[PDB]
Amino acid sequence: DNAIASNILGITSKKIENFSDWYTQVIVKSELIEYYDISGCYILRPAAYYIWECVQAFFNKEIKKLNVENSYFPLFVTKNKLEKEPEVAWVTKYGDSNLPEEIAIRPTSETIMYSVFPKWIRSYRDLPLKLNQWNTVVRWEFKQPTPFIRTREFLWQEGHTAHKNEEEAVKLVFDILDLYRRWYEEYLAVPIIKGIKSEGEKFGGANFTSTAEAFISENGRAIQAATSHYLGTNFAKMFKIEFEDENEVKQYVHQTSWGCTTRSIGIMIMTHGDDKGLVLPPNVSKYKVVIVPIFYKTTDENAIHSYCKDIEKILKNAQINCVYDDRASYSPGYKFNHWELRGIPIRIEVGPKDLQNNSCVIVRRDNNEKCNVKKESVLLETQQMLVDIHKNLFLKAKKKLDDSIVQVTSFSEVMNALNKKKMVLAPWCEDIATEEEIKKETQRLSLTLSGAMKPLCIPLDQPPMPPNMKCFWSGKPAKRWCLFGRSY
Numbered sequence: 001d002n003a004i005a006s007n008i009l010g011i012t013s014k015k016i017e018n019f020s021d022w023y024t025q026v027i028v029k030s031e032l033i034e035y036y037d038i039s040g041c042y043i044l045r046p047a048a049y050y051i052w053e054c055v056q057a058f059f060n061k062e063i064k065k066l067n068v069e070n071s072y073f074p075l076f077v078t079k080n081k082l083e084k085e086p087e088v089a090w091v092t093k094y095g096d097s098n099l100p101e102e103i104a105i106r107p108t109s110e111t112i113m114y115s116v117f118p119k120w121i122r123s124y125r126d127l128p129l130k131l132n133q134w135n136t137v138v139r140w141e142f143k144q145p146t147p148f149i150r151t152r153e154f155l156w157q158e159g160h161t162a163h164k165n166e167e168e169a170v171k172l173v174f175d176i177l178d179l180y181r182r183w184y185e186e187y188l189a190v191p192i193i194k195g196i197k198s199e200g201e202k203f204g205g206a207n208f209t210s211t212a213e214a215f216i217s218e219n220g221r222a223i224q225a226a227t228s229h230y231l232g233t234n235f236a237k238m239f240k241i242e243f244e245d246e247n248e249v250k251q252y253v254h255q256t257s258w259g260c261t262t263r264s265i266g267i268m269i270m271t272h273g274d275d276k277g278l279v280l281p282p283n284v285s286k287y288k289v290v291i292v293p294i295f296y297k298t299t300d301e302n303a304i305h306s307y308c309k310d311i312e313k314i315l316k317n318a319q320i321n322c323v324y325d326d327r328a329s330y331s332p333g334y335k336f337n338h339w340e341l342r343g344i345p346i347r348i349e350v351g352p353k354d355l356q357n358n359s360c361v362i363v364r365r366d367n368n369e370k371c372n373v374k375k376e377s378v379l380l381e382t383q384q385m386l387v388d389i390h391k392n393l394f395l396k397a398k399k400k401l402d403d404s405i406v407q408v409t410s411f412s413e414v415m416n417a418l419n420k421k422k423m424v425l426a427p428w429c430e431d432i433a434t435e436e437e438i439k440k441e442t443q444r445l446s447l448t449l450s451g452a453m454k455p456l457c458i459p460l461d462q463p464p465m466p467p468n469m470k471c472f473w474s475g476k477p478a479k480r481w482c483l484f485g486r487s488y
């Protein structure tokens, strides 16, 4: 429990050698996650919840442009109402007395909301209806949990809309999907692959499911990053959500729903984190800069302290939040590891020579590259470097994603691509019967998580398909290229 020894040790598992232990150490030592006495439930500490507040402000600002309004619906669903559509958590008593009708924690708010929609929708003048919630949902599974990405309770947003026809809803589905892209690219520097889910992997209530897929290249696992469904009139028939149209004729509404969870944070940690600890894209880090003082003698102490307070004022006047670790009990080297492990994008060092030159040293977190900068240039160099740190993080990640995809044309090359922690891009006939056949065979040939291969998504960005190409599995005419891989 010695501070210096713990500081020098940092993360002690190498990301590439022991990924599972590497991930646990990072989330605990960078002060993101705390554990709890109920399995599969975790505490979001400030540094983690700050990230959620950043993406929440962005997604709010964007869905307002689509005229989507936030709201809040009850945490509880009556058994009577939920079972009008079996791992839900059930409230059965208050104090010591049983409830006459059991009560479920929402796993999602479909039945809670769509049950009231008919009261709000009477004619076309009431459409479209566009609602969003920021809440938690509970799903009591006994699979092995994993912080951020696979938990019994998790924070998310769920948005639900209803439209007068199909095209206006289908357009909204993909408009939201691109906001999920920007959520991951512009804020978490994580590249995703837009696609359509296979028939066997889509949401049971949707006509189609569009998805944003991410890939964890260190363990070879694909993970769904966000989702956006076109529900059609399926839920309008269940709940009788009708309206009178412009011709005075009763019609069903066309609905969409879409969500993104704190799994996005987990994906971001697994992408950018290195053997030093957390690595934060500037847009989700509270402190963009850490100012560390360095003292050669005891005489230059009052000057360097004042010089660091000048740089702090320069950055904070430009609304660039920072922190000046003026603690006298720790060495500069200690502070370097301290804030590197916590993922601060930029470190500014001020020493005696840097003060004699009226300059400073600015170190990047992603690649540890240093450069000397004049004091009057500190603000401009910091601004451009925060932008380049993001771009570098994203481009390096997009490289790892692209290199994780092996385009194949026969099944005889599938197992070799899987065992190299990759996913295959294969031409597929999209027949639903083949989805389980591919799972059973890929896991059979694999010799804890599963070894089976499942249809991840059919990408929107389709490679050229020669009109005579056949399915990599059945040999029947192929329809589109499909990503297949191992998942959680």
Ligand SMILES: O=C(C[C@H]1NCCC[C@@H]1OC(=O)NS(=O)(=O)N1CCN(C(=O)Nc2nccnc2C(=O)NC2Cc3ccccc3C2)CC1)Cn1cnc2cc(Br)c(Cl)cc2c1=O
Binding pocket: 040, 086, 087, 088, 107, 108, 109, 110, 139, 140, 141, 142, 143, 144, 145, 146, 148, 149, 150, 151, 152, 153, 154, 158, 159, 203, 224, 225, 226, 227, 257, 258, 259, 260, 261, 262, 263
């Ligand atoms: O809701 C819907 C329809 C839509 N509704 C509005 C819009 C949004 C919806 O769009 C989706 O399709 N969302 S999705 O949830 O399917 N999708 C999103 C992307 N994913 C995440 O990011 N997930 C997470 N993020 C962070 C942490 N953990 C997880 C996570 O998965 N934990 C679990 C796995 C795991 C592993 C170990 C331990 C515990 C656990 C729990 C998960 C996949 C479908 N659905 C799902 N399930 C239901 C369940 C019941 Br019970 C009933 Cl009754 C109904 C439904 C139902 O209707």
